[PDB]
Design a protein around this ligand. Structure first.
Ligand code: CL
Ligand code: CL
Ligand code: CL
Ligand code: CL
Ligand code: CL
Ligand code: CL
Ligand code: CL
Ligand code: CL
Ligand code: CL
Ligand code: NA
Length: 129
């Protein structure tokens, strides 16, 4: 599913991401924009052989199982495929664990490089939240 901006903002809020670990909703929407372009089916193969999955490009080295990332963990206790669902519940629940892991949203390279410090409120502009 390719979410619209405000549609994703709404879904993330429903699932309790807004202000989770002090990160306003706009940070999460911005992260999703630059991680996946709002596409739940987004995947990215990394050089280390791991893969990023879903609207927030959650990585198989730690967070989900894809059966093809040797030595990796599955801390969200899900198949990585669950992160590709039109329903973002699994991605959000896993994002919550990730952002609590110690480095906050810096876990998302696109957030750090393209959202952090910017006017993230713009990502929820016009949205009926
Ligand atoms: Cl689509
Ligand atoms: Cl929308
Ligand atoms: Cl957009
Ligand atoms: Cl915001
Ligand atoms: Cl694996
Ligand atoms: Cl594990
Ligand atoms: Cl699995
Ligand atoms: Cl959803
Ligand atoms: Cl933080
Ligand atoms: Na894994």
């Amino acid at each position: 599913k390719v979410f619209g901006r405000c549609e994703l903002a709404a879904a993330m809020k429903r699932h309790g991401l807004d202000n989770y670990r002090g990160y306003s909703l706009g940070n999460w929407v911005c992260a999703a924009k630059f991680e996946s372009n709002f596409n739940t089916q987004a995947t990215n193969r990394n050089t280390d052989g791991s893969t990023d999955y879903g609207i927030l490009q959650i990585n198989s080295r730690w967070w989900c199982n894809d059966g093809r990332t040797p030595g990796s963990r599955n801390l969200c206790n899900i198949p990585c495929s669950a992160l590709l669902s039109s329903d973002i519940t699994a991605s959000v629940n896993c994002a919550k664990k990730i952002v609590s892991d110690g480095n906050g949203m810096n876990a998302w390279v696109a957030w750090r490089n393209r959202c952090k410090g910017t006017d993230v409120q713009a990502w929820i502009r016009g949205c009926r939240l």
